[PDB]
Amino acid sequence: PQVLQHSVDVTEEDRGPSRSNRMEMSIFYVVYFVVFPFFFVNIFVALIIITFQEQGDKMMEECSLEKNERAC
Amino acid sequence: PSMRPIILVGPSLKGYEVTDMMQKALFDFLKHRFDGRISITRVTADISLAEVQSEIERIFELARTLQLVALDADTINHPAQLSKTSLAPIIVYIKITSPKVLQRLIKSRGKSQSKHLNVQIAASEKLAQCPPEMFDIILDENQLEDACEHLAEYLEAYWKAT
Amino acid sequence: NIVRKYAKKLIDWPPFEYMILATIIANCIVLALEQHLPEDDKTPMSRRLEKTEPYFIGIFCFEAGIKIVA
Amino acid sequence: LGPHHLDEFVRVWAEYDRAACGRIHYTEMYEMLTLMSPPLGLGKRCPSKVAYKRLVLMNMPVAEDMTVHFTSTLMALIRTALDIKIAKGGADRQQLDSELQKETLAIWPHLSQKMLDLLVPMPKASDLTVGKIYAA
Amino acid sequence: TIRILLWTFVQSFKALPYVCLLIAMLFFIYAIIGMQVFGNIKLDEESHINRHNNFRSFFGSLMLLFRSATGE
Amino acid sequence: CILLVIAASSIALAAEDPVLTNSERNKVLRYFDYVFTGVFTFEMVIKMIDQGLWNILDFVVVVGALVAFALANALGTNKGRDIKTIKSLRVLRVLRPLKTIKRLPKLKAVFDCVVTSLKNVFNILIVYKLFMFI
Amino acid sequence: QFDNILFAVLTVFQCITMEGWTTVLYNTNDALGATWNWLYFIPLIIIGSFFVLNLVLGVLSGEFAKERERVENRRAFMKLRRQQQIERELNGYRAWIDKAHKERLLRISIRHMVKSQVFYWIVLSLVALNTACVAIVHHNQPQWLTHLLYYAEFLFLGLFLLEMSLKMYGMGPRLYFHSSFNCFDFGVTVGSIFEVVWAIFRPGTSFGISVLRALRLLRIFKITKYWASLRNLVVSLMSSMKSIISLLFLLFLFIVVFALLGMQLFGGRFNFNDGTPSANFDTFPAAIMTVFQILTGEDWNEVMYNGIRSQGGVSSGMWSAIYFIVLTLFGNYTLLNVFLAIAVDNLANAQELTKDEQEEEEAFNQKHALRHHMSVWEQRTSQLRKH
Numbered sequence A: 001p002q003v004l005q006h007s008v009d010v011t012e013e014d015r016g017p018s019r020s021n022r023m024e025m026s027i028f029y030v031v032y033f034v035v036f037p038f039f040f041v042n043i044f045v046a047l048i049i050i051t052f053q054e055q056g057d058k059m060m061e062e063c064s065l066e067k068n069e070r071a072c
Numbered sequence B: 001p002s003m004r005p006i007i008l009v010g011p012s013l014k015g016y017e018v019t020d021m022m023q024k025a026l027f028d029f030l031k032h033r034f035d036g037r038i039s040i041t042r043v044t045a046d047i048s049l050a051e052v053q054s055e056i057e058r059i060f061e062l063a064r065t066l067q068l069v070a071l072d073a074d075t076i077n078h079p080a081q082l083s084k085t086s087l088a089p090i091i092v093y094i095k096i097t098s099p100k101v102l103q104r105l106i107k108s109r110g111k112s113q114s115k116h117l118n119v120q121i122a123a124s125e126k127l128a129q130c131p132p133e134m135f136d137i138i139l140d141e142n143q144l145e146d147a148c149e150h151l152a153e154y155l156e157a158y159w160k161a162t
Numbered sequence C: 001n002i003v004r005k006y007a008k009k010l011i012d013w014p015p016f017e018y019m020i021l022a023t024i025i026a027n028c029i030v031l032a033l034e035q036h037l038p039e040d041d042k043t044p045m046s047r048r049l050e051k052t053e054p055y056f057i058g059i060f061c062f063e064a065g066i067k068i069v070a
Numbered sequence D: 001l002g003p004h005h006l007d008e009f010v011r012v013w014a015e016y017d018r019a020a021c022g023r024i025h026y027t028e029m030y031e032m033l034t035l036m037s038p039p040l041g042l043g044k045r046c047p048s049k050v051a052y053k054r055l056v057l058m059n060m061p062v063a064e065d066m067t068v069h070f071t072s073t074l075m076a077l078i079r080t081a082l083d084i085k086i087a088k089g090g091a092d093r094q095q096l097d098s099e100l101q102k103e104t105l106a107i108w109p110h111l112s113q114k115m116l117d118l119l120v121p122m123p124k125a126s127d128l129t130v131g132k133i134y135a136a
Numbered sequence E: 001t002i003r004i005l006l007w008t009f010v011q012s013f014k015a016l017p018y019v020c021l022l023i024a025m026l027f028f029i030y031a032i033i034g035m036q037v038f039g040n041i042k043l044d045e046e047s048h049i050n051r052h053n054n055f056r057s058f059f060g061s062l063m064l065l066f067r068s069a070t071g072e
Numbered sequence F: 001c002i003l004l005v006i007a008a009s010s011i012a013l014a015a016e017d018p019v020l021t022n023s024e025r026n027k028v029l030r031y032f033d034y035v036f037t038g039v040f041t042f043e044m045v046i047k048m049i050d051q052g053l054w055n056i057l058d059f060v061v062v063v064g065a066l067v068a069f070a071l072a073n074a075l076g077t078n079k080g081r082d083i084k085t086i087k088s089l090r091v092l093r094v095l096r097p098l099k100t101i102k103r104l105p106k107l108k109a110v111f112d113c114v115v116t117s118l119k120n121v122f123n124i125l126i127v128y129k130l131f132m133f134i
Numbered sequence G: 001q002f003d004n005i006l007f008a009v010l011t012v013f014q015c016i017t018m019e020g021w022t023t024v025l026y027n028t029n030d031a032l033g034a035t036w037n038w039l040y041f042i043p044l045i046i047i048g049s050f051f052v053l054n055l056v057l058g059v060l061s062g063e064f065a066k067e068r069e070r071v072e073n074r075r076a077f078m079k080l081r082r083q084q085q086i087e088r089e090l091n092g093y094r095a096w097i098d099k100a101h102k103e104r105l106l107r108i109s110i111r112h113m114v115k116s117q118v119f120y121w122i123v124l125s126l127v128a129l130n131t132a133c134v135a136i137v138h139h140n141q142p143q144w145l146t147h148l149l150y151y152a153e154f155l156f157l158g159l160f161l162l163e164m165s166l167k168m169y170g171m172g173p174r175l176y177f178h179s180s181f182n183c184f185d186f187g188v189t190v191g192s193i194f195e196v197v198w199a200i201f202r203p204g205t206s207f208g209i210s211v212l213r214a215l216r217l218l219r220i221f222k223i224t225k226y227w228a229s230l231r232n233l234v235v236s237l238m239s240s241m242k243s244i245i246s247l248l249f250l251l252f253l254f255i256v257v258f259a260l261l262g263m264q265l266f267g268g269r270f271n272f273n274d275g276t277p278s279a280n281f282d283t284f285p286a287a288i289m290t291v292f293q294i295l296t297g298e299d300w301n302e303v304m305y306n307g308i309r310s311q312g313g314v315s316s317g318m319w320s321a322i323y324f325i326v327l328t329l330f331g332n333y334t335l336l337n338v339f340l341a342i343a344v345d346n347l348a349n350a351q352e353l354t355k356d357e358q359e360e361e362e363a364f365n366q367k368h369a370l371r372h373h374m375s376v377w378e379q380r381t382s383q384l385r386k387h
């Protein structure tokens, strides 16, 4: 928010701010959030959940017949 | 005959751009890979009706030179439609394994063919219901390399046998 | 109360339910344009937009009536 | 069916064992299954013969006292519900039971042969199995 | 149902004694680093290296990394 | 026996005083630092005699210690701004807790699980780094 | 302060949301003593916030795997796996169409060159300079750069217009928009022209959509074995796009209603004698972007102190902590739920789609032309498919 506030309160190159000017520069920060914190970070959490391998499973075809529901 | 003639069929009716280009690409492969061993002939007479018989010995006398010939027919589009002649060709089948790819292919090939989609689809269905053993070779492969190697290896087997 | 021959269920035609979805989006823009000033103060624009409330109620109250009938 | 749907068997035993009758009499084998719900209990709504012959497919052995074993009873409910090496009938059922014993050792060798045969009864056919009791 | 969620998820924190030791070694390494490198900054209450938040001690810097890990 | 020197030297890092450089605690701990690095070298040399030429990380730590103890004890002065040199060569000692990653066959199996999971998200951590660049 | 029970289940809800949990910890170190307080707050952040992400991620992840195997959700995936088969085999069947004055003399050799493998590595070695020309524009950059990089648009805009022609007047206007990134190429070539014109009429803000051409460097993945994994992600994201767009729009109709409701309660009431904060509720653009602070949950704290002293103080006006609690609790876990369902449904599809290529194109045909390291998600979602 302190970067949103400065990015809104913006006037020109080598000029001090002016509050609530350029309030349309808050679209750069909702399009950034919808992409990187919401979408992309949840691609990382989901490529690790989806592609997670059991630590060690080398017990005769991993207990050839008896498996997760069958063994436990 | 000395060498069994090569005749291609299966996508759709000949004359349509789809089957025309399919066969012409396959024959370009045959030429530029086997350059100096196969002579390509274009046929405009109805072989099934055997000037009709004027070209049959012409095919023979290129087939009577210990060399393979590819038959660019333009009226035969069925295995049973040539079950009567004594040519005994090798029937390589350029197979399409789904109607949907067929409609997409014909539609994507301009708009002049788009007015003839239904008839080509019907003839392709008719070909599909034909029994598989009526074709000497099956080519349902997608990549040019795969079907080219398949046909090349079969022709190589024939050439080593004779 | 349950009287048939509504002649109202026939009114739920597709030209009729895309004007309610048009008055709602219009309504959602009037609410978007209002600015809230501290102590009974009102901007001149927000005094104009307060004149549309009888219309938006007029349409939304029409729908309840025509639906509780149909 | 999972370990969730199996603690019920531990629970439902308690209301009719009352810390005493672990050799529980076999009348409850129908009563217990109706009380419970699928996928462990048969259920009280539709006990239909094709549904119930799963219990006949679950050829639980009986002793001289018309009694069953808690450990043995628990496995047979598992084995039919999870379709673990379940055959249609005949000695081919026991042919897979040899594996049913064998597979256990390579996983849990800590079990003896009695408790192996407790987990895999391999009932002898001439005895009236629980399924055969109610099939007759 | 609240106890099985707790039981199931705390049993699987007991099957991974070493996964919460690479994380406790990340917090160890950084801590040490912050000590030698950031340890002699003079505390100024205007800044965020306060008397509360600093690198002057192992536990004073382990709290700085936990305060920072939790996004604060 | 090595693995306890690893875990006793890594606590000699957590006890040092960052501000009071020459406190009495730091004077003792700078006698331990010779003892701990003496063990590591005579665990490296016998290892490199009996194996021939992770072990780079061990190699760096022992050299970084000797170089620090050499140029500080030998002269320590007469070079431009060389107090910062040992102060930046002793930050290599922080790698001593990292020597235990491969000494424990079960901790190494967890480190190789993080690395193997950093390679699954790597063709998306390049798309992420390219969208974050646009 | 934990004065009451209602003042304590809000000071501890603040710390679990991990907003300002250190000012709470640093107050009770001054007030009481810094020896025992850490036993209250570290076990509270770990259990309350970290250990509840583990449960929420786990409970959600299992729920998304049980729903992927619903009959209504396999039926709509096999209908996606099918059109991927058609498109895959049709590509080979369009490869066979390999036809061997200026109507047929230039348009024959152009499309020969402009599809050659030395052409791609020219454009992608020339879009890797356009994305390093606009990567060095800093502030106060030397005067030679400002002019040098000023021509660097026109050299690149003109040249990328040159290759926009060879794909149009050498391969076809109608037969120009059949590829995805080929439509992307048009999207920014007109877009880059728009910046040029718009900057002459209004010098200043130059948001500059010509670095969007850097998205063609993603096609360097085609030369790697990581194209199937990545194309199947976009193929799955594009198929389920009317359900992501109509799901970002229900996450926007609940930001609006809330923003609206936030103006009714705190509109015009943030005129404090210090000055109205930047996180107002007075106008709609400022009410939307402070509900977006509370949803993403960062400094929902400070917006609540203003919203409490707005309606009174720590007094008859602290009933307004319900707005900032219901809204940072149902946006902390509703954005995670929505945006992880989008990223798990469309990412477990791109894991079976890229697996039914290797398991056909390298297992099914390679034979008929003559487990095995399955993750926990893959095994458990196959036992759930076999019921």
Ligand SMILES: CC(C)CCC[C@@H](C)[C@H]1CC[C@H]2[C@@H]3CC=C4C[C@@H](OC(=O)CCC(=O)O)CC[C@]4(C)[C@H]3CC[C@]12C
Residues within 6 Å of the ligand: A022, A024, A025, A027, A028, A031, F131, F134, G205, G207
């Ligand atoms: C495929 C991904 C990587 C593309 C990401 C870019 C777009 C999705 C976003 C990112 C930044 C956004 C822009 C950020 C700011 C502005 C300026 C805004 O208008 C202004 O403020 C310009 C004039 C002025 O400053 O007065 C109009 C929307 C726009 C172009 C936004 C439109 C959407 C953009 C291009």
Ligand SMILES: CC(C)CCC[C@@H](C)[C@H]1CC[C@H]2[C@@H]3CC=C4C[C@@H](OC(=O)CCC(=O)O)CC[C@]4(C)[C@H]3CC[C@]12C
Residues within 6 Å of the ligand: E020, E021, E023, E024, E027, E059, E060, E062, E063, E065, E066, G034, G035, G038, G042
């Ligand atoms: C998932 C877990 C089991 C992995 C291992 C634990 C870690 C998550 C670390 C990161 C933050 C660490 C904490 C950061 C700060 C402190 C305060 C510290 O406090 C003191 O010694 C005195 C008071 C002060 O901090 O000033 C005691 C250790 C402790 C609780 C640390 C214990 C170990 C923690 C929880």
Ligand SMILES: CC(C)CCC[C@@H](C)[C@H]1CC[C@H]2[C@@H]3CC=C4C[C@@H](OC(=O)CCC(=O)O)CC[C@]4(C)[C@H]3CC[C@]12C
Residues within 6 Å of the ligand: F007, F008, F009, F011, F012, F015, F024, F025, F026, F028, F029, F032
């Ligand atoms: C808590 C233990 C079990 C952890 C494992 C490591 C310990 C066996 C040893 C290894 C090195 C030891 C340190 C070596 C030297 C010193 C200096 C010693 O003397 C002082 O500096 C005190 C001076 C004063 O009284 O002001 C205080 C303990 C301490 C930090 C020792 C604390 C205990 C340590 C960490």
Ligand SMILES: CC(C)CCC[C@@H](C)[C@H]1CC[C@H]2[C@@H]3CC=C4C[C@@H](OC(=O)CCC(=O)O)CC[C@]4(C)[C@H]3CC[C@]12C
Residues within 6 Å of the ligand: G131, G132, G135, G136, G137, G138, G139, G140, G141, G142
């Ligand atoms: C090929 C692409 C993907 C990467 C290109 C490199 C840029 C991402 C970075 C790397 C180094 C950066 C430079 C590092 C240091 C400086 C000095 C600094 O500027 C000054 O020296 C201040 C005075 C002035 O020149 O205005 C900031 C800009 C600049 C040129 C940076 C500009 C952007 C650069 C070239």
Ligand SMILES: CCCCCCCCCCCCCCCC
Residues within 6 Å of the ligand: A020, A023, A024, A026, A027, A030, G283, G285, G286, G288, G289
């Ligand atoms: C406050 C004076 C008028 C400001 C007008 C700004 C218009 C653009 C608003 C952008 C922020 C709202 C984004 C909505 C979607 C999240």
Ligand SMILES: CCCCCCCCCCCCCCCC
Residues within 6 Å of the ligand: A035, A039, F127, G180, G218, G221, G230, G231, G233, G234
């Ligand atoms: C046929 C297109 C292939 C593209 C290959 C690279 C794709 C990388 C993933 C792109 C994800 C974009 C998400 C944008 C934000 C919603």
Ligand SMILES: [Ca+2]
Residues within 6 Å of the ligand: E070, E071, E072, G018, G019, G297, G298, G299
């Ligand atoms: Ca925060």
